[model samples]
Target: SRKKMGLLVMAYGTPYKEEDIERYYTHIRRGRKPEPEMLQDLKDRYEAIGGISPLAQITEQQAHNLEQHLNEIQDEITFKAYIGLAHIEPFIEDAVAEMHKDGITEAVSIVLAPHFSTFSVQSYNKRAKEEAEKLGGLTITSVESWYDEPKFVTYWVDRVKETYASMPEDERENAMLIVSAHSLPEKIKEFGDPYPDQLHESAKLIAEGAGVSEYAVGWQSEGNTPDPWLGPDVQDLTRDLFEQKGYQAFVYVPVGFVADHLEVLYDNDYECKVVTDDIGASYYRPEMPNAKPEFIDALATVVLKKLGR
Candidate 1:
């Protein structure tokens, strides 16, 4: 049997605390000070999530769980899954270097984010390719985007159903589902980026799978840039749902985010929750599909399919 290949999972990193905000921001901006307002907004989002995010830890656990799942399900193939962050610990180059040392010659790169745009997932692929080139003899296959994966769609549907099943019947009657993802500057969209379009496709598939007929997709985690960000923003959506549409309850799903990171924790759990409550609309957020057994299986299936296994 051929020796099994290696897998690498990449993600957008987060700061551990307010103290690390400057360093984290510096890494994100590639050593440029984008703007004071934007920096402060980023700081605020991190601060709201208990001044830290467990993104890195969650990613590592997800990767380990995936490895374990693959081991149990496929006896003939063996592989190792390594996790890395784009802007924090275990950066792309270093992670690839470690993999090279570990004798990982054939690999597949997967970003934790389900949806992709040139601005996000492509950047990760570019970085990984750059590093893989330095370590010759490595055949690195990357899953650029899985927004349309049937298994992924089904997993998200199950997640939403489970969350909705727990709520009161009355709450479900007049509820509006708000699907959202992290926002990119609107200029990117104007410049013909596909982030927004990709996000909608994921949301639409997920909604159809979940049997949700009444839903809207919105953008969240917009930075404090004078340039426009994708919208109608999550906050505006919530207000409109309750005040204009007369929605009594809201189901907020961070479809673009795969884990319970700062964006979901602070943006949805804290900030958006407050907005919903203030508008007298009961709000709930579905948990991320992080390391869910089915999701892991889906990931494994994706990898194997890519390798023509």
Candidate 2:
């Protein structure tokens, strides 16, 4: 008999509207309310990015497309994919309950992020497993990291070429790639987490594959707290690379994030661009993977391998 399986795909959720920003921020802070100025700053960022992030819609598309790809490529098991948000409506627990009600006896819980960290992918998987235990009968396995997935690497390589080719010839001559990921607390190093190493590895693979010799790995979107997060910040790095290294333009590769959202739209595109412009250099970033056919196929491959197909 064909088995029935659930693909519980979890992501960092986004507020659906301006009014939901406060509530979303509170959830992100583990129910602690943000100070009024802090909340307003977040609101302003969202407003700058056209009033709403496309994260929710893109994540839903990714899940839907992944379900289609899995079902089409295999007959050993029927697949159903569901989107679970980490900090918003239709949360991980909600998706787990629905999967149980739908009679999914087993599932593979995967985060949209490409790399793993105890504080990230593991945390999301932990929530999924916890919810499953409460419901009973649903076994949850997870894909901790798919950073070096072949197609994923190839996608970025192609994007790098495309973006580089689009730059003005003068800028291209002095352009350098700045590959980056979201910054996490520097304390993770003490725990020996592979997050930083993985980001660098992916950056190396993409740079070599794209045949670009001048590149550097950096971090972006660190929290406002003083606990100290990863660096050098992308904006700071951009300025330094221009002034010190004499690079005339930059191509940013947000390899850590798979979809376009607040971090990519606001932080990299807008904020980073502002820095580049002030220094008389140009800024560019490849389009995100976001539910594209090749990306869906990559996700399907990750699932198939996890299931031992």
Candidate 3:
């Protein structure tokens, strides 16, 4: 029988709408509901970012874009794509099951995120694989992270240049460049967690390739949990650059994110704008690589290489 191949693009899902917040976040917490204050905080973030997350639709677009690209490359095989979310319906396992049901016994999966961490990205594959075991087993190829992929780095470089080119000539020199990734607990390193290193490596690759020598790394969108998370938090870092360093312009390079969601939308675009205004600095983030053709090309190329194997 000719193998029916498929592509699974996984992401950390966001609420599809305001009303879905409770159920969505509760699933994120693994059945532990959020506190009232915490819930309101999330609600406020959503409100500031246009009342909902764009991740779901963006992921949908990515899947479609990848499928289209794959089809364009060659007609030998038709490729199907599924968008699986870690904390949302059509969850990872469901996605795997659906693939199997669709007659796709073999598929290559890739987390949409660029950086890798056992605490986060690895669990997506683990969940899918575990579910596959229950369903009698599946042949799954998981692409852990594409951080250092040439196309990946090239896209970041291009996006940064586009953003930097848009800044006023005089303001550009003063604009402090900071790259950030999703924050995790510092203790995750007890097992020698490689996330921090991978994220920093990705940032460095883009910065160096783009001739950005003077830049720093930070972490953002940390959870509300009390245990200390990785830093320097972008929020705090941006403030200091405003209040102490006297830098009045900022360039935010979200190297870790492949798409825009609450973190970049509200946390940086809305919340940080307020912070910047109070501190006499303005926050500016480059457009993210959301379903960008180049991004799709990168993913398609990766998937194709795996499929041809």
Candidate 4:
């Protein structure tokens, strides 16, 4: 068979409509059905974020743009991009199976997220390899984390610098930048997951590169489970910065997330906004790298390097 390359782009999926919330939530909970109140809460959050999360559409667009860039830059073998939603339709397994069916014997699986965690991004690759194992033919190589990919870091640094420059001159001096990521369970410490350290490194690099000295790493969008999640929470950090440290303006740099989704749109923009509003402080977030040309170049950089280009 002629050489063909498949790019399995995986992401945490989001429901497209109010009706899909239950199913999406259940899948996130690994088939455990959510209580009515829990389901309703999710519905309300989606409503708050304009009736739908743009994650689904944005992920596909990112993959599409990445595919186009990869093909335009290199002509070794044809490149085909496949979107594999971690918790919804066209899942990691489905996409892997499709890649095999499309005559793709060699493929690189990269999660849309830049950081790696045992319970999160790693699962995407695990499922991809599992499907390939069952289907027999496709060889899967996973890019664990591009958190420090030069272009990836550059995107964050540039955005942070631009956003910082835009803030009011008086507010800028006292503003405390909160570099954030999704909070995983505290149990990850036992497994020795590199997530904590990776988050720290990326946060430091971004903050330093942007020339922002007054900053601290924060966590957000923790699961509904009772298990203790990583902290200090973004809201908590914001409150402390306002009440304890006397800071008024906040710059929320979501370096943990690549796109604007529920976590960013609702969790930070809405939920966290409520916190800052209550304290009479300002909350600001830089725009995400959704389908941006530079971001696509970063994705292409990862894939091409994986392909040894």
Candidate 5:
């Protein structure tokens, strides 16, 4: 007998347009409106990044991609993949609610993030399970993380090598690698969350796989909250190279991100690039794993493994 399954993909939502920014940001803040300055700064950031973020769109693509892959299994494994954003449209609660309405008996959830942070992945899973409980007659299991997935690690190793191998052999030596991920609040350490360590572990594995000895692991896209998030920031890491260490160029590997989003498009390619240029150093990021054929395969593999295939 064929079993009906649902893949609930969770992600950090982005505003689809300029006008959507405030609404989306408010959702992120749990309906608390942002102050004037913060709101304006986000508006400016959106304008600078072409007035739209591809996050929502790309996440849809990932959901569809995963749906297609799961169904491709030789044995009849029918899947209906639903996208739920942690903050914004197609909320996690709504996705699970839809699952219950559709008569889905069982489902599994995987946050689009590869690293398991109590702050992000855990919270998303909690919301999903709670929603399922409220709806009843539905069971949803959550994947912890896929950071060290062999194919994932290998994919990034090749990505890193691709960056360094692009330049002439002599000039390539002038560039260094800066592996980065989205930063979380510093409070994560108190709970024994493995996020900070996982980021470094993933970085170390890729660095070793790429034979990159001159690489640094850092955090990026920190929020406006006070008291601190993870560090050292990518910009600070970049400054250390150009101002003190004299590296002429750097490659940014956003390992924490599975797809192209505002952070990758605006934060790194624009804001960080500007900082790199100002300091007389060049900045480049590897192509993100957005809807790539192999990445889809990786997602399918991870999900199936979690299902005990």
Candidate 6:
């Protein structure tokens, strides 16, 4: 007697223990040597975070919370939510299959990543579509990108402002904002990919919202490529802040990423922290908005608005 809708949340997953590190590294590297040093770094980060990323769990919570919120606001409608990982167990294809088994004819697919780019959101959307096609006769409504959503912008701005406000009064004035995003190959940028541009826009929006006119956008998590990748890497940027700008306090906002994974935990937290300390700068990174009530509420609003609820 009612229409059924399924919400699929997608994410890039991580492995938990040292033994599982190789599997994940191989997956990302696609059967390469899987650098020993990098894997060790990852292992250490995971250990520090208690042997696993909270990203998947947090995503699940967000999806369930949205379902609960939707149930409270709507009547005579059947809604179910599921979380899928693009690179791990309970993959996108399986998630869609399960939804189909549950008699979900109409579905909405959303990436856990807040910001959008062809490489990130498009990849997830493509996989979901491919899987949905396998089952046949499923109408897929994809929220491919939400980079410019008003609620998303507001939530990020609020998070950044709150982080800054928590710093000591004297430190706030000297705090230099560094917005870092995961690095893409130079070839990808040369081909006119919009990732760099979109990342810049996100950084600009956050800077304007936080009332911090002095900020820099840099690249992080570069792979082992001989060719040059995006310039002004986070390590180099931190050095520049100390040597050129003479800033002693730094605040890093990873707007391009929505959760703490190997990159945020190992690359930014551990590696970048070392650089900042060596350069005589005090550094702090804003925690990802994972499972934050405001963030979850904002995401729920996005889904509700998309479904015309």
Q: State how far residue 281 of model 2 sits from its true place (Å).
A: 1.2
Q: Write the per-residue lDDT of candidate 5 for residues 33-110, one digit (tens) a residue.
A: 889899999888767766665656888888998899789864657889998888777889999999999989899899
The residue-by-residue lDDT of candidate 2 on 50-150, one tens digit each, is: 76756578888999999998999889988899888888878888999999999998998779999999788888899999999998999989999998999
Residue pairs that clash (backbone atoms under 3 angstroms), model 5: none
lDDT of 4 at 200: 92
- Clashing residue pairs for model 6: none
Instruction: List candidate 3 segments past 4 Å from native.
Output: 306-309
Cα miss at 230, model 6 (Å)? Answer: 2.7
State each candidate's clash count: 0, 0, 0, 0, 0, 0
For 76-184, candidate 3 gives per-residue lDDT tens digits of: 7677888788887778888988988887877788998888898778999888778777876467888888887788789888877776677787667766778899999
Worst 10 residues of 1 by lDDT: 47-56
Using all chains and alpha carbons, the TM-scores for the candidates as numbered come to 0.90, 0.97, 0.93, 0.96, 0.96, 0.90
Report the candidate with higher lDDT, 4 versus 5.
Answer: 4
* Clashing residue pairs in candidate 2 (N, C-alpha, C atoms within 3 angstroms): none
Measured with C-alpha atoms, the lDDT of residue 116 in candidate 5 is 96
Off by over 4 Å in 6: 16-19, 33-41, 53-55
Candidate 5 weakest ten by summed lDDT: 46-55
**TM-score, candidate number 6:** 0.90
lDDT values for all models: 0.81, 0.89, 0.81, 0.87, 0.86, 0.77
